[PDB]
Assembly symmetry: C3
């Protein structure tokens, strides 16, 4: 395989490494490295801890971006400081359980997998060692996404280009943290020690936390997402295990690929869309008003009470034609 | 803003205020009033009570119907007989969290919001005061829908008009009523007193009741929905917090907008469709047979056991070509 | 009704009785017989038992295949060895609650129903006696599917024929088996005796088991699904009560009708699709690589821990252009 090689420097979510949309490049071998990290992390503002397992230290793992026809060559590294075997499975790839059957590595090992990007869209990747370990590693944080763009960039299905000014990757994670008898969340010394209690809870199918970017409030405050009025923003949303229903409060999905695959035309003008568990989707919106927006799953219990809220802070001029407060709060006549 | 003004007299669901489909009118300011009512109501045939909070005294709130390009001017009134602050957020609107950030009113106050109807479809509206109050006010009943029609009326995506003979609005509500130790549903003296137990249950994500039009059996008996053979009926279905899967037992969705947005062509000939939590959808069906139909969510446990069943009573002539009992029940030979 | 009559010999899932895709036949009366069987069965590898109720002795019931415009004439038989009344409701049919209102039969009785196949797609059929019995009979196993093909066969929505080389029917069943105080699954002497405990659990909405073809591991080992590289396989997936998110691990959905209705064009290149509870869908894939694939619902807890995994064993030549292990596991440098 004698194609040019291009290295990518991955960046932590919700940011995305620099890439072209439409390109005049032909197929390349695009080289990525992912290093697995098992670590105890804090997941909420009360200080609840969690035995996480991650690609590159983040939940979600970083977004990888290539074009249709590229070959994706991933070096997966499992350092000796980890305790368990791991692998990687790409929903974008064809064969060998997505790559999982060719990438099982013990602590202290690495492996190199190449796959051809023959299908366009956004796709989940995740660890999948085998058996009951599969859901456990996924819900512990071992999932991310890849985006495979058409070489001509995105289009609206009617012959018009859609170009985004920026892209963000929102990875949603369902977490299962057991409680003790008095009702406090339990802490564990190792992923192995968390396993028995965690599996019992997992099989009851109700998460304790549903978070974006690994923690309650991760995409708020100094880390709110940003835009300006007039900017077209692409939001890639993934959920490797459980359904989600994204919604931009105060906005819309102007162009939405809820099943996430660019060979299908987008739907237009959505209020709320649906990300099937085990998939990624994408939505584009051109901001028309300044101020704060919330990006949520629109099970509002999960959004407000279990962690699944991000903010956008948008700069620009208020449009009174679109919306105006005609009369401020006042006493009823 | 010097456009003509038109007042609308809202009607209680499942009925919808009179409106045009295709229209020769240009944009207008369409004026609506919603008055919030907190009240204890009965939700099932066993006499279980519930601390409801409503727009205009109903669950769901009434359907508001306008055309693309209209300006919707809503007077929201929070009488002094209520106990909590409230607001309103329209998924159809652009900016200020859908209007929520401009409409927070204490008991004794009112506010007037105007928004331009730039996106067509059916959309949820709901209360959203802030923080954990958001899911609580929604699942207590503070949600409804708005329909924004194209000025040319509905079409099938192939150049043909779809015209409905009647429209019904089915609002589905997930309710969370706690139980006492012996397993009976609890009653509370105020919404505030219901809050702690209700929030604990809400975060476990399993409703005690799933109802149409506010109560088990609301859309049955004297209040069954009606049609005649030959009539094209539009059913608007909303769910502000939790997914639903509508199904017309004995019929179909001839033309369905499950994501609810009229800039997309409908799908045809569905058995069951899907309403994402936080959205409204719409389905049209031309009745071909008389008799009783059930309209359900097709999680049949929720339909039969938790409350989510409506009936249609349809008049007309039976069509033996479509279906016939060839041999009535008889002893096996 | 003076049309030719054709008998069909039904076969047990996941296989499908022989049929034509495109046909030069005109409408016929196609005759099917279903015999209800109530029986205690084993549902997992630990030996948990379950009070099943079935059409033709299987979960799911067999797939019935006809063409648009055919008349489907079903003889439903309820032998005297059963204990309860039963009926059948077809989502493909028009009127009388899908046929349910014309087919209620006591043990010892049979009935004959005919319906015209006016809508194309895959559709659920299920028992629906009345009231709380409806969900109970469905989740006890009394559901299957019918496929109504266009007379010209399937197409891609762009004028090209899709022809499948083989079709499999995967019926997914959510099961509710109660536990005793010490946490073991309970066994019951009759469906009637299982009813009270089972209904209590059902209303909590969380299944104990989620299985394909009636049992954990049913579609594995000697009973894995099979294909060869180059073969186009259609997978029909039904779920009569609860949502599912099918995914072919290591493959894709090349052409997918997730709502299951052939008057709509398929979507292309999906990773995971969505079967609404109360529906059937269909996906086609042309295998490109040999080896083992898993077909799952991509709630991985349900797939790995509650039973919802099937295998495909695929023969043929490995394609190193699509995927290759560049460097086998080795020590980190
Ligand atoms: O981008 C995928 C497809 O989208 C549309 C275009 O008409 C087609 O040429 C293109 O291949
Ligand atoms: O109604 C939305 C659209 O539907 C279709 C028509 O071709 C188009 O003219 C219209 O704007
Ligand atoms: O198969 C359903 C429809 O699919 C497409 C064809 O253009 C149309 O002729 C056919 O009726
Ligand atoms: O945007 C993708 C869509 O656009 C088209 O190429 C042109 O309509 C379709 O063939 C494709 O499904
Ligand atoms: O029904 C709405 C659909 O109808 C069309 O206008 C004509 O096909 C499309 O552009 C639109 O998405
Ligand atoms: O595959 C079904 C689809 O194919 C067409 O006949 C041709 O595009 C459409 O009218 C239909 O919805
Ligand atoms: Cu792992
Ligand atoms: Cu996967
Ligand atoms: Cu409120
Ligand atoms: Cu909302
Ligand atoms: Cu039955
Ligand atoms: Cu049904």
């Amino acid at each position: 395989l004698k194609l040019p090689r291009q290295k990518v420097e991955l960046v932590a979510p919700p940011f995305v490494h620099a890439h072209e949309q439409a390109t005049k490049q032909g197929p390349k071998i695009v080289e990525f490295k992912l290093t697995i990290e098992e670590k105890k992390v804090v997941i909420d503002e009360k200080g609840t801890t969690f035995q996480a397992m991650t690609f590159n230290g983040s939940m979600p793992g970083p977004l990888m971006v290539v074009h249709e026809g590229d070959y994706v060559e991933t070096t997966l590294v499992n350092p000796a400081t980890n305790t368990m075997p791991h692998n990687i499975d790409f929903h974008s790839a064809t064969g060998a359980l997505g790559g999982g059957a060719l990438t099982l590595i013990n602590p202290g090992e690495q492996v190199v997998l190449r796959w051809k990007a023959t299908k366009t869209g956004v796709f989940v990747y995740h660890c999948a060692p085998g058996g009951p370990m599969i859901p456990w590693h996924v819900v512990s944080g071992m999932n991310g996404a890849v985006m495979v763009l058409p070489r001509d960039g995105l289009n609206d299905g009617k012959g018009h280009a859609l170009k985004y000014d920026k892209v963000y990757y929102v990875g949603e994670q369902d977490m299962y943290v057991p409680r003790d008898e008095k009702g406090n969340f339990k802490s564990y010394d190792s992923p192995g020690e968390a396993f028995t209690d965690t599996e019992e809870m997992m099989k009851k199918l109700i998460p304790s936390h549903v978070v974006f970017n690994g923690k309650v409030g991760a995409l708020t405050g100094k880390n709110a997402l940003t835009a300006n009025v007039g900017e077209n923003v692409l939001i890639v949303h993934s959920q490797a295990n459980r359904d989600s229903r994204p919604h931009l409060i105060g906005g819309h999905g102007d162009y939405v690929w809820e099943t996430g695959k660019f060979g299908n035309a987008p739907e237009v003008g959505l209020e709320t869309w649906f990300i099937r568990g085990g998939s990624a989707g994408a939505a584009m919106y051109k901001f028309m008003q300044p101020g704060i927006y919330a990006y949520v799953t629109h099970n509002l219990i999960e959004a407000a009470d279990l962690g699944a809220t991000a903010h956008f802070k948008v700069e620009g001029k208020w449009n009174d034609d679109l919306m105006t407060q005609v009369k401020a709060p006042a006493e009823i006549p």
